[PDB]
């Protein structure tokens, strides 16, 4: 995976998101904080139970951001496991 299509595939997602909300920079920060939050609720040595986090939450937070604008949501969903149908 030196530079698989998936790599540029991901970059395109983040890029488009940036160029999309050029007027609303605050949006960019949030999205990144979402994926970032995931990482936070992972470390801390042993994964002791305490309402952690995973892909499910990230999907919600990002969805909350891109409300109505499910266009970008579709891209994010591609990475996440497809639900029913």
């Amino acid at each position: 995976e030196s530079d698989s299509v998936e790599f540029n595939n991901a970059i395109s997602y983040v890029n488009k998101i940036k160029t999309r909300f050029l007027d609303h920079p605050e949006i960019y920060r949030s999205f990144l904080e979402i994926l970032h939050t995931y990482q936070k609720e992972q470390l801390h040595t042993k994964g002791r139970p305490f309402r952690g986090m995973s892909e499910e939450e990230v999907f919600t937070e990002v969805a909350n951001l891109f409300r109505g604008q499910e266009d970008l949501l579709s891209e994010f969903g591609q990475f996440l496991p497809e639900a029913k149908r």
Binding site: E6, A10, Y13, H36, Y38, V58
Partner: peptide, 13 residues
């Protein structure tokens, strides 16, 4: 999959 997106942000930034 998240690794690519999360990492992607750093690339552009």
């Amino acid at each position: 999959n998240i690794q690519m997106l999360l990492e992607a942000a750093d690339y552009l930034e």
